[PDB]
Design a protein around this ligand. Structure first.
Ligand SMILES: [Mg+2]
Ligand SMILES: [Mg+2]
Ligand SMILES: [Mg+2]
Ligand SMILES: [Mg+2]
Ligand SMILES: [Mg+2]
Ligand SMILES: [Mg+2]
Ligand SMILES: [Mg+2]
Ligand SMILES: [Mg+2]
Ligand SMILES: [Mg+2]
Ligand SMILES: [Mg+2]
Ligand SMILES: [Mg+2]
Ligand SMILES: [Mg+2]
Ligand SMILES: [Mg+2]
Ligand SMILES: [Mg+2]
Ligand SMILES: [Mg+2]
Ligand SMILES: [Mg+2]
Ligand SMILES: [Mg+2]
Ligand SMILES: [Mg+2]
Ligand SMILES: [Mg+2]
Ligand SMILES: [Mg+2]
Ligand SMILES: [Mg+2]
Ligand SMILES: [Mg+2]
Ligand SMILES: [Mg+2]
Ligand SMILES: [Mg+2]
Ligand SMILES: [Mg+2]
Ligand SMILES: [Mg+2]
Ligand SMILES: [Mg+2]
Ligand SMILES: [Mg+2]
Ligand SMILES: [Mg+2]
Ligand SMILES: [Mg+2]
Ligand SMILES: [Mg+2]
Ligand SMILES: [Mg+2]
Ligand SMILES: [Mg+2]
Ligand SMILES: [Mg+2]
Ligand SMILES: [Mg+2]
Ligand SMILES: [Mg+2]
Ligand SMILES: [Mg+2]
Ligand SMILES: [Mg+2]
Ligand SMILES: [Mg+2]
Ligand SMILES: [Mg+2]
Ligand SMILES: [Mg+2]
Ligand SMILES: [Mg+2]
Ligand SMILES: [Mg+2]
Ligand SMILES: [Mg+2]
Ligand SMILES: [Mg+2]
Ligand SMILES: [Mg+2]
Ligand SMILES: [Mg+2]
Lengths: 120, 122, 114, 209, 56
RNA sequence: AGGACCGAACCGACUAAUGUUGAAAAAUUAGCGGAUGACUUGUGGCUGGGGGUGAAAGGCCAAUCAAACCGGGAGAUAGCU
RNA sequence: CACAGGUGGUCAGGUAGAGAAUACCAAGGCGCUUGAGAGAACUCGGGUGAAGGAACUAGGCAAAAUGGUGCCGUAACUUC
RNA sequence: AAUUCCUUGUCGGGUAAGUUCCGACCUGCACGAAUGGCGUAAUGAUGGCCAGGCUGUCUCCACCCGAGACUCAGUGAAAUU
RNA sequence: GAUGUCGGCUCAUCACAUCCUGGGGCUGAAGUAGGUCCCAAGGGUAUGGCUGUUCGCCAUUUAAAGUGGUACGCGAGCUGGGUUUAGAACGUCGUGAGACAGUUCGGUCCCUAUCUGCCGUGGGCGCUGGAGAACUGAGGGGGGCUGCUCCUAGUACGAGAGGACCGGAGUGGACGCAUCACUGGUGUUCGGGUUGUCAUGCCAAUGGCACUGCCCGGUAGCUAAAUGCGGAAGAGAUAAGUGCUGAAAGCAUCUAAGCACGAAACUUGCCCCGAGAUGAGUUCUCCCUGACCCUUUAAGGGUCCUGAAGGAACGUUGAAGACGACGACGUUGAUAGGCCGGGUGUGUAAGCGCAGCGAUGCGUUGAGCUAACCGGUACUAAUGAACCGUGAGGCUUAACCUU
């Protein structure tokens, strides 16, 4: 039974899941639009959205917290300088998932995940 | 929570130091003895020139357990170790005269009255 | 849950003093011998606190006749009349179950003067 | 006597002055509305139908709404029936409240138990496991034998096997009613009752007592 | 473990009676580009619910 | 000094689990034994079938051993199926 | 078999370490040619566990446990 | 007794309880002196027994992490009959 | 041209020649406890030591530790200790090879389930217009065990010793159901400590890897060892048995007529499934009230228009779940996530400052972080639609409309 449990295992261990999401978090922040699988995209929301939220209160402790969960200083910078200010007024929902069909190789259901205000 | 093969310390001056529970008395297939429950014991360790001696089979009542008692408010009292007070086989009154260590009010019954009195606590 | 919250806080106590794991505490507890009830004291060290509203609990471990005695108290029970910090203790851990292993000078709590 | 429908809010305790902690399930018993009185003539048995709670006008179907509208009651979340014992009368539109349990001492509660899905024999039927070691080849929690040899030559019916466990109607009987709170629409029942927090409960007085 | 008798052509088809695929019950049409697409999915030209949220 | 001690490479294979249409016609995993010797290993060489070789288990002699393999006698014979 | 096997020699970086052990790394090289989801039973490989502690079992099988350096200390017996 | 049928021999130890174990007894069914007899320190992946410690071995299972099992897509067996 | 053989484990099922519990007659039955037979198979019916054991002895339990059948039930479920391969040895027989219903030590247990069967779970069609709900309950299943203490009463009984039925009250054991409020376990998704090493340029702070590196704690959920509940009472008809009246048979006779007592068995009562109950049932509510062509004119086929109730699909999802299914929600919205606030857990972050040669300590400060929790909030994502499903529902008879 899985009753009231959150957290997709995604046919990985904990270390691999944390690491992929850290990678997927930075790719999103960097590209502002990434194609992944739909279930990965739904979890990605639970990793990426709290960092944008942390990125509104620019304290050095916050840069350190983001660096611990991002391990990239391009991503911390873009969070606290561009994303944090850009989502200053938004009470959550920084990302939007848009389903985009099935992958040719394995028929995985895909989804584009995006920042709600891309402006490119 | 006292079952067969569990070692118990002794809470009396009978002469035994260590005893082993060999039978939880009461019902059939009765798995455990708690505080206030009579058990059958063998003495695995005794002091020389004592009332009891090693290998003697007799009865004991549990007075303290590591699992502990439960109270009606939901409070639990747990002891550091499991201890017993030896009892005669056909009389079930205590062999000793002193009771060493605390006891509980789960022994406040006509049968165990001569233990709560001689105890230093409850 | 607001239902349960309201039903819970309606019987919670108001007098519960602040204490901390490591503090030495004299819990006064009712014992009913027949009909006439008298308070009994259990002085010892707080090794664990559970903070869950009405379901809050705290464990006091004391040594008695060489026999380590732990008592888990339900802090909002009417069985418990009074909690009283007699000594504050400086520990760095929420839970002090390691004090079970220790004895005498090994299980001493340095005093808090914060 | 009839019973009432409610909802599982959760469990709490009631401390008494004497020192006793009483575990209770809190049952939210909103006012039960009679939607249909079945009588011996037209229906063939004497019962009442009730609804309670609320449903969206947008999620009520037209068949449901006419049935509520005929009774002159607001659409609740479901329909439940209670049989009548030959003296108790009721009228459509009549609102029955938790005060009906004011004088009762013990109640039977029924709900849908928590669902455990596909359960093994160990969990579902208290089947003892086999040896964890001492040679055991792939048969640690497996059910063992399921029968005899070329005489029945088949598995008998009702053989305790692995499958769906829970998510079924369960009645727990003779539960002490701790407190009836009419102004707050709550029944307090000593002890656990079936199902998950937030689940429909039916509460009746105890048959046995 | 294994069959004592060859199952027939008929038993084989009865097993496959549930093997038919369901078709798409309906395609949805974009309010702006008129493309057909899977409902709640984006179009092949990059439109979702009339908005062009892809580059291509 | 040592057919000495602990322990890797290296050589082996006591237990257990896995696997038993295997990843594998004998392995894998965890542990286990020897580990300067009667050790181990490479290259090449010699011993040939009632023969070899064997610290001896009828063990091994190209996944084959109480008489190898291939070919021949040969369509042995088969009061049996 | 693009097979968890077998296959001799040579080269031998850094931190820790007695070490060619072990962990992490460098150089260099790989991610093992189906993937995507789900988070049932059961199986496998593992982690933890109240109280009890071999009551298991043919058998403590397996697990758990012990494990290092130095100082002290070390029985029976003995071919010393 | 790696030898004893009778046999779980008798007694004793150890255990609450011991067909095993140890010790002694002799009634050696059916030991016995280099197909060696009796001992024997050390050694043993040797056989049997005991204890300390340890533990999911067990009482009596519970939860968790992973690989499968289940679902989708692709490839696509087998024994049997 | 193979039906795997002892015992164990797991799971069991029937029989009754009944071990306990229940009901009873005789007793050389005072009472307590027994003896023996009759009825009764509802439920229940040990853990250990020794041995491969079945068994048996012994220890200690229990209300009792029943007897048998099921391939001496169960190896395509487990084990492999015994026993029947190859090794080796003792004794013994034999010149010997070898051998023993003698012993010893050691020694590969395969199978992805087609059918039946079983446990679960769905799809299809049917149930005669379609649809959404609520039900009746034919039938089926589950459950059915009992100890101890106290009162009645130290009474009835008995010379004493001891010591009741009947009825009653409480508390346990075992089994089962539910559940998480408590007590706990778990918690590789929370926090913290810490060893070694690498990296983030370095300091400081962090992260990776080392079984989650090792540990200490611990949310939710799941859960037992935790805590609530249950077995019933009662009714009906009976068993063995006890009787009333009562002839046949002037009497007697429980029986022939007739009448009544009488048990955990039976039927009910309690719980669960349940109209595929094709004998397909009932009740409530909802929807559909148009044109016509055709011809073997028949429950006929086709065209146009219409497309409902509702359903499904899709999507967000769930204390529901293998998949289906079930439930909740879909902007007229709290369905999920995010966010806010709280709680919870961890236990006083970082940075700065003070003290100290320094390790570190103190202060800012119960700080910082905080998963699944609570209460809220449309920020994100749950599309305007399309799709399926129709268009008043056979014949015959009867009654009511309307005797
Ligand atoms: Mg996969
Ligand atoms: Mg790791
Ligand atoms: Mg469930
Ligand atoms: Mg296994
Ligand atoms: Mg048959
Ligand atoms: Mg050597
Ligand atoms: Mg050596
Ligand atoms: Mg090599
Ligand atoms: Mg290998
Ligand atoms: Mg190995
Ligand atoms: Mg060595
Ligand atoms: Mg031979
Ligand atoms: Mg060969
Ligand atoms: Mg020739
Ligand atoms: Mg021929
Ligand atoms: Mg010839
Ligand atoms: Mg490959
Ligand atoms: Mg290495
Ligand atoms: Mg799993
Ligand atoms: Mg444990
Ligand atoms: Mg422990
Ligand atoms: Mg044993
Ligand atoms: Mg046993
Ligand atoms: Mg044995
Ligand atoms: Mg071992
Ligand atoms: Mg280990
Ligand atoms: Mg023993
Ligand atoms: Mg033994
Ligand atoms: Mg000889
Ligand atoms: Mg030896
Ligand atoms: Mg496939
Ligand atoms: Mg074929
Ligand atoms: Mg009979
Ligand atoms: Mg009955
Ligand atoms: Mg026995
Ligand atoms: Mg039987
Ligand atoms: Mg058999
Ligand atoms: Mg079989
Ligand atoms: Mg054997
Ligand atoms: Mg097998
Ligand atoms: Mg068949
Ligand atoms: Mg928990
Ligand atoms: Mg540093
Ligand atoms: Mg690295
Ligand atoms: Mg980690
Ligand atoms: Mg600070
Ligand atoms: Mg909320």
């Amino acid at each position: 039974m899985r009753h009231r449990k959150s957290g997709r295992q995604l046919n990985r261990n904990s270390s691999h899941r944390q690491a992929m999401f850290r990678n997927m978090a930075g790719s999103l922040v960097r590209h502002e639009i990434i194609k992944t699988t739909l279930p990965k995209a739904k979890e990605l929301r639970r990793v990426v959205e709290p960092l944008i939220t942390l990125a509104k209160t620019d304290s050095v402790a916050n840069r350190r917290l983001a660096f611990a969960r991002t391990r990239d200083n391009e991503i911390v910078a873009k969070l606290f300088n561009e994303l944090g200010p850009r989502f200053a007024s938004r009470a959550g929902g920084y990302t939007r998932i848009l389903k985009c069909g099935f992958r040719a190789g394995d028929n995985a259901p895909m989804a584009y995940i995006e920042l709600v205000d891309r402006s490119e | 929570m006292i079952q067969e093969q569990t070692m118990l310390n002794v809470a009396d001056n009978s002469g035994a130091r260590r005893v082993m529970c060999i039978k939880v008395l009461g019902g059939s297939h009765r798995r455990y003895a708690g505080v206030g429950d009579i058990i059958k014991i063998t003495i695995k360790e005794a002091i020389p020139r004592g009332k009891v001696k090693k290998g003697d089979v007799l009865k004991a009542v549990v007075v303290r357990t590591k699992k502990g008692v439960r109270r009606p408010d939901g409070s639990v009292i747990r002891f550091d170790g499991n201890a017993c007070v030896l009892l005669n086989n056909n009389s079930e009154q205590p062999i000793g005269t002193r009771i060493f260590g605390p006891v509980t009010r789960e022994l406040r019954s006509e049968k165990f009255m001569k233990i709560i009195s001689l105890a230093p606590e409850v | 849950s607001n239902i349960i919250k309201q039903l819970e806080q309606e019987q919670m106590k108001q007098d519960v003093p602040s204490f901390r794991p490591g503090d030495t505490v004299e819990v006064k507890v009712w014992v009913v011998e027949g009909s006439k009830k008298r308070l009994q004291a259990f002085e010892g060290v707080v090794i664990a606190i559970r903070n869950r509203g009405l379901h809050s609990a705290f464990t006091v471990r004391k040594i008695s006749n060489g026999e380590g005695v732990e008592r888990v108290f339900q802090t909002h029970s009417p069985v418990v009349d009074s909690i009283s910090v007699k000594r504050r203790g400086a520990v760095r851990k929420a839970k002090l179950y390691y004090l079970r292993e220790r004895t005498g000078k090994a299980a001493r709590i340095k005093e808090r003067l914060n | 006597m009839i019973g009432l429908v409610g909802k599982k809010v959760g469990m709490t305790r009631i401390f008494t002055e004497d020192g006793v902690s009483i575990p209770v399930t809190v049952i939210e018993v909103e006012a039960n509305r009679v939607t249909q009185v079945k009588d011996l003539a037209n229906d063939g048995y004497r019962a009442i139908q009730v609804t309670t709670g609320a449903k969206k006008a947008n999620r009520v179907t037209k068949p449901e709404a006419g049935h509520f509208a005929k009774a002159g009651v607001e659409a609740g979340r479901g329909l439940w029936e209670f049989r009548l014992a030959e003296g108790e009368e009721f009228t459509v539109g009549q609102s029955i409240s938790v005060e009906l349990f004011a004088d009762v001492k013990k109640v039977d509660v029924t709900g849908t138990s928590k669902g455990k899905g596909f359960a093994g024999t160990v969990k579902r039927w208290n089947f003892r496991t086999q040896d964890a070691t001492h040679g055991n080849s792939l048969s640690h929690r497996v059910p063992g034998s399921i029968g005899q040899n070329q005489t029945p030559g088949k598995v008998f019916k009702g053989k305790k096997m692995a499958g769906q466990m829970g998510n079924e109607r369960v009645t727990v009987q003779s539960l002490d009613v701790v407190r009836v709170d009419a102004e707050r629409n709550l029944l307090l029942v000593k002890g656990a009752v079936p199902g998950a927090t937030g689940s429909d409960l039916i509460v009746k007085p105890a048959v046995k007592a | 473990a294994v069959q004592q008798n060859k199952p027939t052509r008929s038993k084989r088809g009865m097993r496959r009676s549930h093997d038919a695929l369901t078709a798409v019950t309906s395609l949805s049409v974009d309010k702006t580009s008129g493309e057909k697409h899977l409902r709640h999915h984006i179009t092949a030209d990059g439109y979702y619910r009339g908005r062009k949220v892809i580059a291509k």
